[PDB]
């Protein structure tokens, strides 16, 4: 298989196009000077995430390819926004599938799903990350962060905005280098040498709560807890997991390309033994996926599907193995927010572990038959793709060759799909691999009205961005470990459009101005995930041949209806079609 290198970057609170037009394109335009590069693909999603996948020719040294891609991106780093840099970018050589999954549950029930995830990240992830041949570690959850949940009604009562919150957190959660007394060069006769310690980073919600935002004209003081709720919480709330229907976290372990499969695994098991003695009470390590014996179940919902609906499909899948195949299934580790492909609020995956091979006798109880029956039972779940598989059509890319745009490329894609549907004698299941457009909330800042009232645009864009998307301010120390501080609106005040007017920004003359005074909004349709192939906007289309015909004829046909597509629409083969 051709070695592949993936680049990962994230932009908190950014939509798909913002991410593509600020990160993806800039990285792609600097991927030159790379040897033996076959093709390049990328995704920019409304989660605020980019994954650029560069596939290299066979026989290429994956170490050299990663080094060359790592160095090129290092040069493109100053071209990316500060927010993307603060998140840290990753360049990883690895396969697409997992080598093993390390589950962590809590029998006592003293730790919830959120706490279990924070413990595994704060005490297990990094050491497993440095182990022999582990290329990619995926946390099924999120490490804790100092979450500031702002309330807009209290901020308006004290004439404050999220800009003041972010400014005060950076000032009062600082690690100050203050020098020394009697330091070098010293006056002669000096007998005292001592380090000066000014402000240290905060360590508790109590400390963050008494961050002084401002003092009023009558002497009373406004603390950060007077305008927000200070709690520990995850950096993101995208991914949550469950082991046999009970709260769980874990680590997805991918093998680094070229590493030995088993000896790696034993090394993970070795490091895990070093951790177990210092677990809190109730914490326990389970091994739900060890690469017969195991299989996976993919769950994909259409774009615009929430975690609630995805969780419903996962429960139905988990309930099937735990009830109608309990004689065969030992355990089920289910994750929502993470699918085989990547991340998504509409995706999920379930790692199914079987009982010992000897205890399941006959053809009817082995992984082949169990996956066939499971797929048959999940096939009638409405508005969801649910497949079960262990461990042959075509892979087609529709390319925007002349700067047409996303909307025009969508129409051309639908035109190719409609014509391919009229040939059931040839191609079946012709489908796009990406996502469809979803309603999005377009808001326009009136510059004239903003300037007439004396309201800065950056104050407006920070108030909107930090409240409704979240803002990574700086770092703090949680039990001796560096973690992030996040500023965001409490759930209450960022759920429905009328809440936009609840947010106030301070003008140059001290007047509090609501968002309704200088904004206007409308519903429209945009994309939740934007695909690119070889630097150009693209749309992946999957399909296969009809009963009893070779893909060559299949492929040849697809080429032909692509020729009748509008001017400026190209195409290219990728994957196993290349």
């Amino acid at each position: 298989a051709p070695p592949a290198v993936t680049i990962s970057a994230s932009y908190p609170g950014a939509d798909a196009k913002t991410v593509q037009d600020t990160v993806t394109q800039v990285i792609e335009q600097n991927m030159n000077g790379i040897d033996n590069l076959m093709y390049m693909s990328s995704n920019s999603d409304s989660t605020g995430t980019v994954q650029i996948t560069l596939t290299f020719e066979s026989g290429t040294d994956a170490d050299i390819a990663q080094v060359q891609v790592q160095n090129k991106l290092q040069l493109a780093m100053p071209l990316l926004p500060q927010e993307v840099q603060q998140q840290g970018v990753s360049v990883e050589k690895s396969s697409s599938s997992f080598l093993m999954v390390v589950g962590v549950i809590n029998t006592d029930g003293t730790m919830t799903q959120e706490d279990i995830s924070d413990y595994v990240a704060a005490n297990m992830k990094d050491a497993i990350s440095r182990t022999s041949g582990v290329g990619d570690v995926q946390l099924f959850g999120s490490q804790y962060a100092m979450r500031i949940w702002m309330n807009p009604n209290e901020l308006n009562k004290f004439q404050l905005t999220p800009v003041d919150v972010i400014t005060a957190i950076k000032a009062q959660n600082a690690q100050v280098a203050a020098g020394q007394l009697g330091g070098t060069p010293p006056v002669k006769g000096q007998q005292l040498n001592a380090s000066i310690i000014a402000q240290t980073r905060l360590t508790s919600t109590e400390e963050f709560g008494k961050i002084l935002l401002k003092v009023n004209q009558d002497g009373s003081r406004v603390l950060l807890r007077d305008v927000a709720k200070i709690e520990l919480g995850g950096e993101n709330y995208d991914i949550i997991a469950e082991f046999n229907g009970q709260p769980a976290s874990g680590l997805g372990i991918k093998l680094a390309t070229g590493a030995n499969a088993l000896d790696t695994a034993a090394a993970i098991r070795a490091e895990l033994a070093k951790m177990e003695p210092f677990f809190p009470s109730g914490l326990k390590i389970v091994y739900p996926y060890d690469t017969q014996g195991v299989f996976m179940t993919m769950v994909q919902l259409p774009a615009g599907a929430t975690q609630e609906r995805t969780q419903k499909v996962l429960n139905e899948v988990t309930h099937y193995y735990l009830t109608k195949e309990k004689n065969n299934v030992e355990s089920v580790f289910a994750v929502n927010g993470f699918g085989f492909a990547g991340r998504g609020q509409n995706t999920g995956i379930a790692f199914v572990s079987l009982k010992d091979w000897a205890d399941r006798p006959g053809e009817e109880n082995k992984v082949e038959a169990i996956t066939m029956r499971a797929t048959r039972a999940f096939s009638q779940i409405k508005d969801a793709m649910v497949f079960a598989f262990n461990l042959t059509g075509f892979d087609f890319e529709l390319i925007d060759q002349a700067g047409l745009g996303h909307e025009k490329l969508t129409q051309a894609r639908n035109q190719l799909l409609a014509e391919a549907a009229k040939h059931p004698d040839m191609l079946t299941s012709v489908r796009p691999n990406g996502l469809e457009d979803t309603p999005q909330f377009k808001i326009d800042i009136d510059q004239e009205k903003a300037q007439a009232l004396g309201v800065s645009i950056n104050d407006i864009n920070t108030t909107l961005g930090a409240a409704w998307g979240g803002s990574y301010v700086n770092d703090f120390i949680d039990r001796g470990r560096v973690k992030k501080v996040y500023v965001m609106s409490e759930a209450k005040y960022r759920m429905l459009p009328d809440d936009i007017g609840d947010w106030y920004v301070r003008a140059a003359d001290g007047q509090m101005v609501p968002f309704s005074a200088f904004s206007s909004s409308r519903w429209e349709y945009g994309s939740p995930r934007l695909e690119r192939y070889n630097g150009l906007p693209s749309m992946e289309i999957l399909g296969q041949a009809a009963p009893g015909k070779s893909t060559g004829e299949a492929m040849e046909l697809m080429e032909q209806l692509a020729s009748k597509l509008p001017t400026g629409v190209g195409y290219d083969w990728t994957g196993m079609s290349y």
């Binding site: 309603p439 009205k449 459009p497 206007s520 909004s521 409308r522 519903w523």
Partner: protein, 160 residues
Amino acid sequence: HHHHHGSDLGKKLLEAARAGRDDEVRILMANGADVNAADVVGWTPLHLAAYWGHLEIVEVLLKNGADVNAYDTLGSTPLHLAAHFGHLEIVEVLLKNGADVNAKDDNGITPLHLAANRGHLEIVEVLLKYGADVNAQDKFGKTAFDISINNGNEDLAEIL
């Protein structure tokens, strides 16, 4: 005019009015699908067809008593969407079926403002022909003439 979230056949009609499947839209109407089914943002099948430019679906829904002046969660009518995206024939069929040419959304934005901002000059004449209040102002006080001044569109200023 503000329709409520639907069920199943109403969802299939909303999904088909968006994709432009004329044959199934007619099938579902004959089986009693709600012509005023709404999604989470308040868009009816008429909203979706006027957005993506499916003129036949616009006529089939209006045939079945679709609300020509349906409001979404922000006050936007199907005429707002059709005039904003340069769909000429739809703006005609909507106005010919009793669409409010002076409908204002939550911001005071009229279909005249949307057609003026995108430079859709054929549509600005159809709207004016049906009695569009040329001196209508949004929340910021802007008229369609102010839009042409700011945009630099002198063809439009001629028309207005």
